[PDB]
């Protein structure tokens, strides 16, 4: 097995795929997944693809498909892998490539997690694609494992990016979202027209009367 391992390694060094694809289909009996590491370690792409194809190793093929350039195959491999890292890498690649048709589809399986939502927000803020993030988070309602943080961040983005649509979402999901994370964002936005309503919903009468006395205009 070490002989065939070094053989396929040397083939990947000189990019001799014409015979590598034949040696893989035959009785190689080598140690797979050992040269695939050196593929991206030594920056030798277009070789680990054929390695991961015949072995059905979805989860690592996306690491090569990101640098390859194809995005449809990345989603087709992520839907078979169903691993968080694979989906995150596919989403980061789609964001780098200015792709949005598959970005929402691949992020639908990322927004389900609470920690990964902050990573997605940090990835979309530095790139400026806030509209794509809003359109991706709009489909969060049509899911089966949504939690509080998703709608919380959605309401925060509405209070910070789309003030013309925050009222409906706030009046609809006021009980689902958390109290402090939304009140802090609303105070940072200095929107006194909704702080009193939110304080009355959570029975914060002191901060409500304080806001009404300090801002009795509306």
């Amino acid at each position: 097995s070490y002989v065939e391992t070094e053989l396929i390694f040397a083939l990947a060094k000189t990019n001799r795929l014409a015979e590598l694809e034949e040696f893989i289909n035959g009785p190689n009996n080598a140690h797979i997944q050992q040269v695939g590491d050196r593929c991206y370690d030594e920056k030798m792409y277009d070789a680990a693809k054929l390695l991961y194809n015949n072995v059905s190793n979805f989860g690592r093929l996306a690491s090569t498909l990101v640098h390859l350039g194809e995005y449809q195959a990345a989603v087709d491999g992520a839907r078979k892998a169903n691993s968080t890292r694979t989906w995150k890498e596919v989403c980061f690649a789609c964001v780098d490539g200015k792709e949005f048709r598959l970005a929402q589809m691949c992020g639908l399986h990322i927004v389900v997690h609470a920690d990964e939502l902050e990573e997605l927000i940090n990835y979309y803020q530095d790139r400026g694609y806030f509209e794509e993030l809003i359109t991706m988070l709009e489909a969060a309602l049509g899911l089966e494992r949504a939690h509080m943080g998703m709608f919380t961040e959605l309401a925060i983005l509405y209070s910070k990016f789309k003030p013309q649509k925050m009222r409906e979402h706030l009046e609809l999901f006021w009980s689902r979202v958390n109290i402090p994370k939304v009140l802090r964002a609303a105070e940072q936005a200095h929107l006194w027209a909704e702080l009193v309503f939110l304080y009355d919903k959570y029975e914060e009468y002191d901060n409500a009367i304080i806001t009404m006395m300090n801002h009795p205009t509306d």
Binding site: G128, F130, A189, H190
Partner: peptide, 16 residues
């Protein structure tokens, strides 16, 4: 495109 500039400026002007 570093839209944080307008992001802050428009909100601060509206608040002021």
């Amino acid at each position: 495109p570093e839209s944080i500039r307008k992001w802050r400026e428009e909100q601060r002007k509206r608040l002021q």
